[PDB]
Amino acid sequence: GWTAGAAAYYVGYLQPRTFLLKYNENGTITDAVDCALDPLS
Amino acid sequence: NGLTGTGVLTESNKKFLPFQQFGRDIADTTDAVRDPQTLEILDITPCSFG
Amino acid sequence: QCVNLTTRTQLPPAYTNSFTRGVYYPDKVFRSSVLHS
Amino acid sequence: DIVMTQTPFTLSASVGDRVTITCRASQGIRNDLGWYQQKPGKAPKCLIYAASSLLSGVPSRFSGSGSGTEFTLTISSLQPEDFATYYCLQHNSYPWTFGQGTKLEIKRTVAAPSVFIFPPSDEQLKSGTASVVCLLNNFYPREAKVQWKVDNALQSGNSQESVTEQDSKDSTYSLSSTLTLSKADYEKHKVYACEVTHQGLSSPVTKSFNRGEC
Amino acid sequence: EVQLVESGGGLVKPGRSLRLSCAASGFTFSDYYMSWIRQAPGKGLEWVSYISSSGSTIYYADSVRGRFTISRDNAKNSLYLQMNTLRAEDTAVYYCARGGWELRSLAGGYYGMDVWGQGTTVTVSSASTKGPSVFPLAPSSKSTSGGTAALGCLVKDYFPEPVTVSWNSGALTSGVHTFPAVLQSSGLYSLSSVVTVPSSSLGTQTYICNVNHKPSNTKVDKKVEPKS
Numbered sequence: 001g002w003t004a005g006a007a008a009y010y011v012g013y014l015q016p017r018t019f020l021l022k023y024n025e026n027g028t029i030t031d032a033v034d035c036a037l038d039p040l041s
Numbered sequence: 042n043g044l045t046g047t048g049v050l051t052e053s054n055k056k057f058l059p060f061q062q063f064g065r066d067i068a069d070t071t072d073a074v075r076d077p078q079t080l081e082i083l084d085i086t087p088c089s090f091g
Numbered sequence: 092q093c094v095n096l097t098t099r100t101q102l103p104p105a106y107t108n109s110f111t112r113g114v115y116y117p118d119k120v121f122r123s124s125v126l127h128s
Numbered sequence: 129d130i131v132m133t134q135t136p137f138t139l140s141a142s143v144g145d146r147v148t149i150t151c152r153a154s155q156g157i158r159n160d161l162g163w164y165q166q167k168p169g170k171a172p173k174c175l176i177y178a179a180s181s182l183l184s185g186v187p188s189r190f191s192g193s194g195s196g197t198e199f200t201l202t203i204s205s206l207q208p209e210d211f212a213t214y215y216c217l218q219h220n221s222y223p224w225t226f227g228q229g230t231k232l233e234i235k236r237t238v239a240a241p242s243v244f245i246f247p248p249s250d251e252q253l254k255s256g257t258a259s260v261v262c263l264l265n266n267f268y269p270r271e272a273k274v275q276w277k278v279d280n281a282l283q284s285g286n287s288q289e290s291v292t293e294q295d296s297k298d299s300t301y302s303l304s305s306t307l308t309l310s311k312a313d314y315e316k317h318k319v320y321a322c323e324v325t326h327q328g329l330s331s332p333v334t335k336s337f338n339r340g341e342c
Numbered sequence: 343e344v345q346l347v348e349s350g351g352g353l354v355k356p357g358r359s360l361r362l363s364c365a366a367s368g369f370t371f372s373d374y375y376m377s378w379i380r381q382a383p384g385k386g387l388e389w390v391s392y393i394s395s396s397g398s399t400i401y402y403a404d405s406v407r408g409r410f411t412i413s414r415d416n417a418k419n420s421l422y423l424q425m426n427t428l429r430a431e432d433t434a435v436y437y438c439a440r441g442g443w444e445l446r447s448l449a450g451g452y453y454g455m456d457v458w459g460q461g462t463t464v465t466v467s468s469a470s471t472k473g474p475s476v477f478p479l480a481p482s483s484k485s486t487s488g489g490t491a492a493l494g495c496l497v498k499d500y501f502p503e504p505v506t507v508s509w510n511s512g513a514l515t516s517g518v519h520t521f522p523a524v525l526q527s528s529g530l531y532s533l534s535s536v537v538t539v540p541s542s543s544l545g546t547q548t549y550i551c552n553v554n555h556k557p558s559n560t561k562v563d564k565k566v567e568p569k570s
């Protein structure tokens with residue numbers, strides 16, 4: 001008798017991407033942008 | 042730790058994560074370092090100026 | 092030692108949006124107030 | 129507990145043909161079954177460990193098929209290193225219970241035995257006991273019958289037999305039956321006979337002697 | 343590699359006790375059930391005892407319960423049987439076996455009884471150690487048929503199971519066939535070894551059976567000749 005609960009998980013896949021990453025006034029990355037993701041970026 | 046250079050060493054306020062040893066500026070020069078024996082962070086400032 | 096307890100009830104594959112997730116440090120370098128690529 | 133039954137139980141085959149062994153169970157075991165092989169005089173070794181999976185170093189002619197019950201081991205293209213006794217064991221619940229074995233014999237054109245009867249030696253009759261030996265030499269079907277008769281009375285319960293391993297050259301068997309009497313009881317009868325029945329004999333063969341006739 | 347050895351067997355008169363020991367090498371001994379498994383002569387395999395780690399769960403057989411006692415020592419990597427008040431149906435070859443794999447940890451190997459010991463022989467007989475009595479079974483016309491005739495040697499009434507009879511100091515290998523020893527009601531063994539030889543050669547050459555009894559020190563050569 002094995003019961004399973006009601007959690008969840010999520011799976012996504014990686015691609016070769018170029019990222020723009022700003023860190024913070026003390027290390028730790030606050031934000032990054034994905035180019036090739038709209039003509040704006 | 043094998044990285045050679047010249048300059049002035051001063052006490053720092055930067056605070057490294059445990060997996061970090063060197064710190065780099067925008068010109069990619071090493072400007073901070075963690076001392077491998079006292080585990081304190083130091084700033085490296087060039088010597089010529091003016 | 093093995094028991095496969097599965098039920099043959101397939102399942103429509105759902106999807107959801109990872110908006111801005113999954114950003115790691117791709118090095119062991121320290122940096123402050125910058126915009127690295 | 130959980131009992132196991134192996135169905136073939138003394139299977140006989142030629143060399144280079146298909147062989148099936150079936151093993152059933154008295155509960156629901158999922159895939160926890162192992163097949164073991166014992167050659168005479170050694171320790172048993174595992175061949176299949178989860179009803180379909182060979183071990184490392186087992187040749188690819190053994191095959192396992194399985195279910196809740198009704199497991200099967202198959203040997204295709206038999207080779208002379210594969211003649212042994214095969215057990216099935218269940219790994220599901222403790223205590224782990226064995227099957228019953230299945231000896232696998234080598235085919236051989238029906239061969240009738242040479243029969244020979246030996247009276248007791250004069251040295252033994254001094255000691256006070258009489259062994260009467262009857263020998264059956266070379267023979268495929270081991271399902272031979274040895275009937276002792278003393279003065280034409282079928283003798284029950286004073287004989288012992290043993291049989292040899294299937295011969296590595298001509299794939300035959302040989303059998304020795306010993307009838308044991310006291311000197312006193314030996315000296316009370318005349319004709320000692322040994323009547324052998326066997327598939328290679330159209331009617332049984334009797335070898336006999338007459339106590340006290342040079 | 344991985345190995346299991348045993349010791350302690352031999353011969354015991356019934357109503358007395360024995361102790362079998364088994365030593366392992368190459369495992370993590372606390373991650374496996376251990377088992378003792380007997381095999382009677384001329385019969386099949388049959389489990390005797392199972393024990394889990396720390397000795398909490400213990401299975402005996404219905405034929406042996408209340409007389410045998412398992413024990414483990416995970417520090418010394420050792421398995422035991424204390425066999426009390428032995429009987430004549432305990433004459434068997436015993437095996438130490440590992441098949442446990444203990445479903446709470448991350449062990450290695452296969453799931454099954456993959457590794458085995460080598461076997462230890464226990465013989466129960468109020469006997470002692472007696473020497474064989476030998477007779478020659480003469481070649482006779484009742485044994486003769488056409489081109490060949492058979493002659494042999496009957497070696498009977500001995501307890502210490504390993505006994506050997508050769509023909510002509512090991513010369514004749516053709517037709518020489520020693521039959522399995524038989525265990526009488528008296529408790530002593532007996533056997534007879536026979537060889538066929540061309541009927542033209544009844545008495546012509548040498549046919550002397552060399553009887554050697556290794557637990558004792560018996561060595562006797564007996565010649566077999568046609569009946570007087």
Ligand SMILES: *[C@@H]1O[C@H](CO)[C@@H](O[C@@H]2O[C@H](CO)[C@@H](O)[C@H](O)[C@H]2NC(C)=O)[C@H](O)[C@H]1NC(C)=O
Nearest residue numbers: 023024025026027028030053054055056057058
């Ligand atoms: C790095 O930045 C964080 C926030 O961006 C700083 O955390 C705050 O520090 C001020 C004063 O230093 C405190 O008054 C706040 O309460 C802090 N906020 C939190 C959420 O902790 C942090 O001090 C900075 N410096 C480091 C980590 O060395």
Ligand SMILES: *[C@@H]1O[C@H](CO)[C@@H](O[C@@H]2O[C@H](CO)[C@@H](O)[C@H](O)[C@H]2NC(C)=O)[C@H](O)[C@H]1NC(C)=O
Nearest residue numbers: 042059061062074075076077078079080081082
């Ligand atoms: C490296 O070795 C030095 C000594 O060779 C250690 O320095 C000691 O640090 C403690 C601080 O807990 C002081 O109380 C001692 O006086 C120091 N010794 C000397 C000789 O200065 C240092 O701790 C060592 N590195 C590590 C990580 O322990």
Ligand SMILES: *[C@@H]1O[C@H](CO)[C@@H](O[C@@H]2O[C@H](CO)[C@@H](O)[C@H](O)[C@H]2NC(C)=O)[C@H](O)[C@H]1NC(C)=O
Nearest residue numbers: 092093094095096157158159160193194195196
């Ligand atoms: C788990 O389910 C599978 C499939 O239902 C069983 O695995 C066998 O899988 C092979 C191919 O991988 C098939 O050809 C067999 O027919 C399957 N066996 C059966 C009996 O259908 C597997 O037996 C199941 N596991 C357990 C422990 O029952």
Ligand SMILES: *[C@@H]1O[C@H](CO)[C@@H](O[C@@H]2O[C@H](CO)[C@@H](O)[C@H](O)[C@H]2NC(C)=O)[C@H](O)[C@H]1NC(C)=O
Nearest residue numbers: 182183184185186187188343344450451452456
């Ligand atoms: C681990 O893998 C090696 C092969 O890399 C196996 O070694 C083979 O063992 C079989 C059985 O004796 C031999 O027929 C092969 O010749 C061996 N090959 C080599 C390269 O040694 C080994 O059996 C494997 N171990 C286990 C436990 O499966």
